[PDB]
Structure 1
Amino acid sequence: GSRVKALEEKVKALEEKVKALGGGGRIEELKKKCEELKKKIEELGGGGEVKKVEEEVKKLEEEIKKL
């Protein structure tokens, strides 16, 4: 399937979008989940599971569609 393909891509839309969206309130917590998402993948290599990151991020990415 992908697993990582979903992690490598989302990381681009995750930050780039928020960095270009510039907002507050809803964006305040939105970034909190972002900084943690980028640090997990870039750092994780053997542990943490790749399927666990693509599933969780699914919530963040979907949130970008609105913002």
Structure 2
Amino acid sequence: GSRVKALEEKVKALEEKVKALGGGGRIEELKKKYEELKKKIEELGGGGEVKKVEEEVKKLEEEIKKL
């Protein structure tokens, strides 16, 4: 998993930015969704699904901008 594992590394790095953006009912809920993201990459065995994971996380940060 030289490509899948790396994917997991980028997702967590973003996680730190979420907790640093604020701290409340909106901020706390946003990060919870992020946890789900980490679990999926772990399940990723090897294929063209890694691309789908990168797109989903992109949405999470987008919400951060709205707030």
Task: Give the TM-score band, short-chain normalised.
Answer: 0.5 to 0.7
Using CA pairs under 8 Å that are at least 6 residues apart, name the structure with larger relative contact order, 1 or 2: 1
Identity %: 99
Paired position in structure 1 for 2:56: 56
Extract unaligned runs of 5+ from structure 1.
Answer: none
Count, aligned residues: 67
- How far, CA to CA, are the matches of 1:5 and 1:62 in structure 2? 23
TM norm structure 1: 0.59
**How far apart are 1:6 and its partner, in Å?**
8.2
Extract unaligned runs of 5+ from structure 2.
Answer: none
RMSD of aligned C-alpha atoms? 3.9
Distance 1:23 1:42, change over 3 A: same
**How far apart are 1:60 and its partner, in Å?**
1.4
Tell me, yes or no, if the aligned pair for 1:18 and 1:27 is still in contact at 8 Å: yes
Tell me, yes or no, if the aligned pair for 2:15 and 2:34 is still in contact at 8 Å: yes
- Greater helix fraction, Structure 1 or Structure 2: 2
TM norm structure 2: 0.59
